[PDB]
């Protein structure tokens, strides 16, 4: 019943090849709805979902203003971080940010986020109390006390607890048909002998939304991790997701293995058996 909105940004410096590239995307749950790319020609926030196209021209102007501002802010932050770590302007580096909010089934505020990573690793993150910071190293401790003195956390609360949850609420209403549906997984199993002694059994889940799902193999009713392989959940490209789980079994003992599939859209966990 709960829902999330996230914005992800990536700034990458390209020394000797122009200003840093900035890419930002926005998501409601597992559904992208906007994008901005500093290298694209339009220089605008662009829709990536049908239900956000309802938004009028003032929305697109304003959201474009906000993301371009972020792009200039994080170009500066790349240079500051270069100074904090004492690195040369010769190398390429990455600043990623994520912010957004969670709401419960009744739409009320659950949690807010506002976090940075530098070169792939935690830098500074707003804590769940929306009052304090977790800094990952001595570089980020510089920023932590700057932001404590300037009360940057307090100045973010109106957005996280107000604009974010209000926007998320509006999007969930505008896109009910897309965002508030559950698509249950379509499941099947495949079977391949790999020698005269063993066989692969593969349990499939297809066409499910949201992406959250659990596939587990049991042997004689007990969980089985030995000789199992679970791939990352992947996008079909049409808005739904796919996953599989495989196990190598002794030839002739296929019937003692069961694959168990749990998903929001299933009123009962599924049990598959060859």
């Amino acid at each position: 019943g709960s829902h999330s909105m996230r914005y992800f940004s990536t700034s990458v410096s390209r020394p000797g090849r122009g200003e840093p590239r900035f890419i930002a995307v926005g998501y409601v749950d597992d559904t992208q709805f906007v994008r901005f790319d500093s290298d694209a020609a339009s220089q605008r926030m662009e829709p990536r979902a049908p239900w956000i196209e309802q938004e009028g021209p003032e929305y697109w102007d304003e959201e474009t203003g906000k993301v371009k501002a972020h792009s200039q802010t994080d170009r500066e932050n790349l240079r500051i971080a270069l100074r904090y770590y004492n690195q040369s302007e010769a190398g390429s580096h990455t600043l990623q940010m994520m912010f957004g909010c969670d709401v419960g089934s009744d739409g009320r505020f659950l949690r807010g986020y506002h976090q940075y990573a530098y070169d792939g690793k935690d830098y500074i993150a707003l804590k769940e109390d929306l009052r304090s910071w977790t800094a990952a190293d001595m570089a980020a401790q510089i920023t932590k006390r700057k932001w404590e003195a300037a009360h940057v956390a307090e100045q973010q609360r109106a957005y996280l607890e107000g604009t974010c949850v209000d926007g998320l609420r509006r999007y969930l209403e505008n896109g009910k048909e897309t965002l508030q549906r559950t698509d249950p997984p379509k499941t099947h199993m495949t079977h391949h002998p790999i020698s005269d002694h063993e066989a692969t059994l593969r349990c499939w889940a297809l066409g499910f939304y949201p992406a959250e799902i659990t596939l587990t193999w049991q042997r004689d009713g007990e969980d089985q991790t030995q000789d199992t392989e679970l791939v990352e959940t992947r996008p079909a490209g049409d808005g739904t997701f796919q996953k599989w789980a495989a196990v190598v079994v002794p030839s002739g003992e296929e019937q003692r293995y069961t694959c168990h599939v749990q998903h929001e859209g299933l009123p009962k966990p599924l049990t598959l058996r060859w």
């Binding site: 926030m45 906000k66 993301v67 802010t73 971080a81 940010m97 912010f99 920023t143 604009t163």
Partner: peptide, 9 residues
Amino acid sequence: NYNYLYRLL
């Protein structure tokens, strides 16, 4: 809705 982000590190 995006946030207004001007804060430097």
